[PDB]
Each structure stands twice: as C-alpha cells, then as structure tokens.
C-alpha cells in the first residue's frame, strides 16, 4: 500500500512508488471515506502512474492513500450461464445472489476481429419496422445507427426494434429460428423514467431469461459511461462466436458515452483536436464499433445497433461525425414527421445509404426489392423537395406534372411509416407501395422493371 | 426458467463459501501443522524478491523462530497483530507490499474461482 | 473402519538407513493429510512429519530435516518414512497418523519400534 | 366466450410452475452433493496456491 500522492481531482489521480504496473492493470486503493475503490493503470510513468478509479473521489486524505496490484492485464469473469442475470457497469449482478463463476477471463480491453474471418452476409430479418427491411435491409453483422436529436425521443423508437426483432423463417429462403435468438442490453447514462420504461417492455418481449443487461444510469459513476461498453461487448463475444447463437446488442445513450470521453480528452496530458474534443476520440469509436461482424465459420453473430442521442441536429458535432463513417447504411429521425404523430419518425431523403445492392438485394436477399428500393428513392424525393419550391414559386403554384409529384409524398409516408405496434412482412411490405407508385403513371416508373410492376399488381 | 436458474445459484454459493469456510479453519490452524516454517519464509520471499529493498520487516515475535533466517538476510524483524502475514516496508521510500495469507485466502476466487469450481462440479 | 498397519522398524546401526511403510485402508486415503509422530519408551510423543492429500506439500521437525523424507503412494494407499543419517536418540516407537482432518491426530496406527545401536 | 377462454389457462400457468418449482429445489440439493464428496479436494487445492 502506496502512499505519497502527487495530483487527485476527479477519477484521475497519480501516486508514486510505482513502476511494477502494466498498461490496463486492476489495482485497488484506500481512501478517506473508508471505501475501497478501483484503478485501471490507463498510463504509466518513471516513479508515478496514471490511475483511473471506477469511481467518483469526494473524500481521500494524503495520510491514508494504497496501491496494490491486483493482476498484471486487467479482466472480467465471463461464463456461458449468465442468461437471465441483470448486471451493472461495476460488473457486479443486480440480482441480489452470489456472483457466477466464470469459464474464462476475458479482457474487458477487447481483441478485435480480423476482416479475413468475415465474408458478406445477407440473411436479413424483420424489424417490425418497414422502411428498414425495404430501404437499406437490415442484416446480422451491419450497423445501423439511428441518428436522434435532442428535444426528441429516443426511447420510444428503441423500444419497437426490440420486441418486433425477429428473423424470417423462409422468407428469405431459410431461417436462423433453428437457433436460439436473444438480446443483449448496456445503457450508458439513464434517469428514472428510461430505467423501467425498458424493462417492462423487456416483459413485451418475454425475455429476461435469455439477456444479458449492463445498465449504467447517471446515479452511477460517470468513469464507468465508457467502461461499460467495451465491457459489454465482451459478453457479446463469448456467447455469439463461442456458443453459436445469434446475440442482438443494443446500445443506446452514445452521448452520454462521449460525456465521459470528453472527461478524460482535456483532464488528462492529451489536447483536443477533433473540435474541441480529444483525438484519441476515433480509436474510443473504433474499438466499439469494428467488434461486431458475422464471421464465416460461425453460425453465430454479433448484430450492433447502435441509437444515438446526440446534440440538437447539427452534422458537425463529433458525434454523428465519425459515426457516419464507420457505418455502411444509416437510417435518421427527424422532426417533419414527428410534427404529424407518426411513429416511428424516420426520415430518408437526407438519409443515405451504401449497402442495398451490395450482397444485399441480391444473393439469399431477395431481389423483388431490389429495383423497388431504386425507385422509392427518386419517388420520395419528387415529393418532400417540392413541397418547399412550392412557397417560392408561388403559394399553391404547381404544374400538371409536379402535382403528381406532392400527391405521393402526404400518401407514402402516412401510411408506410406508421407501423410501431403493426408488424409487416416482405411481402405485405412491397404489395402496398405499388400500389401509391400507381399514381405516377409509366416515365417516373422507368427504374422498375416490366416483371416488377405486374409482379406486385 | 428463472426459478431454476436462481435455485442453483444460491446452492451453488453456499458450497463455495463454504470451501472458504474449511480453508479459514486451516488458518486459524496453519502455525499448528509444522509446515508453517515453509509457509513463513515463501511469503518474506517474495516481499523482498519484488521491489523493496528490505529497509524493515515486520512480522509477530512468536514467527521469529521462523523468520532468524532472513533476519540476517535483510533487515530485521520487530506486530500485525495477524500471525498470519509478513509485511516488507521497502527503502524507495513507503512503498510497503504486504504478502498475507487472507489476502491471497480472499483473491482465491479473485483469481481462480474457475479451478476450484471445476473440480467441485466438473 | 480406519485401519492403519505399520511397517519396516527394526534395528539400524547408527549412520545407516531405513524406511518405514504404512499402508492404509477404510478411507478415501488420497483426500487427506497424513503424519508421522515418535514416541522413545518411557518419554513423549514428537511429531516428526506431515504431508498434504495430493502429496504437493511436506513439513519436518527441527530433529529430523534434512535426514527424513515422507513421501506417499496414492495408488496403493501407502504413506512412506525414509530415514537416512540415524542416531540414537532416533530409537522410538514410530507411529502413522492416518488420518489428519486438516492437522490434527483423527486416528493412530499401531506403530513400528526402530532401534539405532 | 373471452370469460371461459382466461380461466381454462390461468389454471395451467400456475400447476406448470408449481411442478417446476419441484424439480428446481431438488436440483439445487442435486449441485450440492456431487460438491461435498470432493470437498476436501478443492481444499487441498485452495492450500497449495495462498501459500506463495
């Protein structure tokens, strides 16, 4: 026990004595309170090191100060039977019983996954939510961010792709209900209405059996919003790769995530360079997000979805910045259809998207969608764009053709995104949007093909 | 699902506690058995192998029989009040590591809970 | 029942070399520690050594170490006493303590006389 | 129609895990003793390893 402190201010401390510690190294500490906290060894120095305490110092005198080395790497007890059991960012279970014993003890700093061991995937699934399943095809081992303001809900939304997650049985000309399928949940920062709004719609789901929960809520350290991720992640692995089930994870308050990144970019040596925000900002983003991946010779899958929460609605903010980026196809809420009362409120004419015909829309994924997504797009747009030239030119000016084009943007949207509650197939999805694709007569319906329109008459 | 889950969960708990319980009773009764010589020195060993550099020891005057040997190799021998510990107090400065047979007692589900519960169950 | 046989005493010149067996039956012999204590006629009982279940662990008397060396056969349930460099004050009754619960004597064996002379 | 449909599966759902509850509680007991007969060998084990 080590005592000769140098620095100590917030969950970055320095104390000497030190050169016996390694890079990512479990060591405990005394303190004034009369309370043994944690330490990560983050940085090490020549007679001092870096510490970072998974908890928040409000008392530690200079009289009582320790430091005993624990282990060498720094790690988490994880075993395969640990389904149905709640957990918290410390790693302790919530549910009030001994704590499990592990079968490994995995590093909570992550290995990543190499690019070789994955190939495409293009078993796709329903997620109760249309637009998606249509539009950019959510598959296993794909990101998908969905961008949310601030001032608008983030909760709500999330809710609906976890109790409407589900993969086709046939539909896509096989299934993967052969295999169990189960969830995984970490949030990052939650107050008192978001803790039990989620779990009593993990009852919807009637999984709380089969789940893994992380939760980390304000109440709780803020050192332990980007411990918890990785750590989580690392209980994806373990039972996606390794025991061959296809684990959903879902993360949600990735703001609240890059609250406490931001704690430690200027607190710390390190200067901010990403815009008043550190630089070592796009490894904290990769290390998240690059593990994940169906990898080939796994039956297996770990399918992220990250929910973002970032904000207002500006693009240049870090967050949305380099989570744009990483991802391949992204879907975004806005506030022109949350005006209306539609939920979700998914928004796609800003929205882009880099995988629908790329080993999806063809392949296992069926390619009855495949010239249908081509042509929603240049459709929707006719719509949403006008309806802004419209106050220009006039105030109710439009021509023969143009009118055509407003006609379908009210319908498509009303209808089509108002699912929530109301789950569609392939099938009952592309039979109903051809439907208001009739009211654009043949020149606007070039891309669809001369099988496509009669196919889904 | 539930229900049998926790069930043996609180079973299971109660066989690891009480393999701590049976490995306490070995200590309170570890100086009593005659291996506690070989017990003693391992512990001072490492405490002075590592980083300090001896500047004291400290161990009880009852475990000085047992510890006259590294008397004279480092320092000297002055209480824990344990009978169950050798503190080092190193000349960097403090520093101070503490090898004591509780704390290793206590970490032995800290670092090889999957050893013990393999052999207990499979 | 707890059944514990002594064997191999008997007379040694001083210098000179012996080792007692014990073998044991009526227990799981290789879950528990195990002892070697000595009585000379006429005076006390001294343990002289212990060794742990699985073997991984021995512990000697100041009158004996380096001299004796206990050892056990988990297979055949034998414990083992080597004895090298004997002298007088060796010549004792050797009892095999068979079986310690963690330390203590649980059960006694019937002992073997050893004479050095 | 609804009064007669809730009754007749109500009546199952507790009888369902009622039995469950039978079968938990004696594999909790079913853990224990396979343990406390190689008791003293986790012992030994914990032993030998505190003592560095």
């Known amino acids: 026990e080590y005592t000769g402190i140098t620095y100590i201010s917030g969950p970055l401390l320095f104390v000497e004595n030190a050169k016996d510690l390694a890079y990512g190294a479990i060591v405990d500490i005394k303190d004034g309170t009369g309370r043994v906290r944690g330490g990560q060894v983050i940085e090490v120095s020549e007679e001092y090191a870096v510490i970072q305490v998974f908890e928040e110092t409000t008392g530690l005198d200079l009289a009582t100060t320790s430091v005993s080395l624990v282990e060498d790497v720094a790690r988490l007890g994880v075993s395969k039977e640990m389904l149905g059991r709640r957990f918290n960012g410390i790693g302790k279970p919530i549910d009030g019983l001994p704590p499990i014993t592990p079968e490994k003890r995995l590093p909570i700093t992550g290995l990543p996954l190499n690019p070789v061991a994955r190939r495409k995937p293009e078993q796709f699934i329903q997620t109760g939510i249309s637009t998606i399943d249509v539009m950019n095809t959510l598959v296993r081992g794909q990101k998908l961010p969905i961008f949310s303001g601030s001032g608008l809900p983030a909760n709500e939304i999330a809710a609906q792709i976890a109790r409407q997650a589900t993969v086709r049985p046939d539909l896509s000309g096989e299934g993967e209900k052969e295999e169990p399928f189960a969830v995984v949940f970490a949030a990052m920062g939650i107050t008192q209405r978001e803790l039990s709004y989620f779990i009593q719609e993990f009852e919807r789901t009637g999984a709380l059996s089969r789940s893994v929960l992380f939760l980390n809520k304000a109440d709780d350290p803020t050192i332990e919003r980007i411990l918890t991720p990785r750590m989580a992640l690392t209980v994806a692995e373990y039972l996606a790769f390794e025991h061959d089930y296809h684990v959903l994870v879902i993360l949600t308050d990735m703001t609240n995530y890059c609250e406490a990144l931001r704690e430690i970019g200027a607190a710390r040596e390190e200067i901010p360079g990403r815009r008043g925000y550190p630089g070592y900002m796009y490894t904290d983003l990769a290390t998240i997000y690059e593990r994940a991946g169906v990898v080939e010779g796994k039956k297996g899958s770990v399918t992220q979805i990250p929910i973002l929460s970032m904000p207002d609605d500006d693009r240049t903010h870090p967050i949305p910045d380099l989570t744009g980026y990483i991802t391949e196809g992204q879907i975004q809420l806005s506030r022109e259809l949350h005006r209306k009362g539609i939920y979700p409120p998914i928004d796609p004419l800003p929205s882009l998207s880099r995988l629908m015909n790329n080993g999806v829309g063809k392949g296992k994924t069926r390619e009855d969608h495949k010239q249908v997504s081509d042509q929603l797009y240049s459709a929707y747009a006719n719509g949403v764009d006008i309806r802004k030239l419209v106050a220009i030119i006039g105030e109710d000016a439009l021509t023969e053709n143009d009118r055509r084009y407003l006609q379908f943007a009210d319908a498509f949207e009303r209808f089509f995104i108002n699912q929530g509650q109301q789950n569609r197939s392939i099938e009952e999805s592309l039979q109903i949007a051809w439907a208001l694709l009739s009211m654009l007569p043949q020149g606007e319906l070039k891309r669809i093909s001369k099988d496509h329109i009669g196919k889904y008459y | 699902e539930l229900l049998v889950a926790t069930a043996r969960t609180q079973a299971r708990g109660e066989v690891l506690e009480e393999v701590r319980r049976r490995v306490r009773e070995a200590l309170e009764a570890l100086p009593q058995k005659p291996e506690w010589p070989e017990v003693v020195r391992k512990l001072a060993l490492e405490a002075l192998e590592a980083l300090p550099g001896a500047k004291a020891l400290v161990a009880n005057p009852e475990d000085l029989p047992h510890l006259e040997a590294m008397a004279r190799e480092r320092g000297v021998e002055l209480e824990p009040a344990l009978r169950l510990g050798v503190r080092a107090v190193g000349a960097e400065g403090k520093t101070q590591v503490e090898n004591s047979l509780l704390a290793r007692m206590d970490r032995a589900w800290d670092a090889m809970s999957s050893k013990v519960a393999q052999a207990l169950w499979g | 029942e707890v059944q514990l046989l002594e064997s191999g005493g008997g007379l040694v010149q001083p210098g000179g070399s012996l080792r007692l067996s014990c073998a044991a039956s009526?227990?799981?012999?290789?879950?528990?520690?195990m002892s070697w204590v000595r009585q000379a006629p006429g005076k006390g009982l001294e343990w002289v050594s212990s060794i742990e279940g699985s073997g991984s662990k021995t512990y000697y008397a100041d009158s004996v170490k380096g001299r004796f060396t206990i050892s056990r056969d988990n297979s055949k349930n034998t414990l083992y006493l080597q004895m090298n460099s004997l002298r007088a004050e060796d010549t004792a009754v050797y009892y095999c303590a068979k079986r310690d619960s963690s330390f203590g004597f649980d059960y006694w064996g019937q002992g073997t006389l050893v004479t050095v002379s | 129609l609804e009064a007669q449909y809730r009754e007749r599966e109500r009546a199952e759902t507790e009888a369902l895990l009622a039995r469950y509850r039978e079968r938990a509680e004696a594999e909790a007991k079913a853990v224990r003793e396979k343990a406390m007969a190689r008791l003293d060998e986790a012992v030994a084990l914990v032993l030998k390893e505190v003592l560095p």
């Open positions: 009526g227990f799981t012999f290789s879950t528990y520690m």
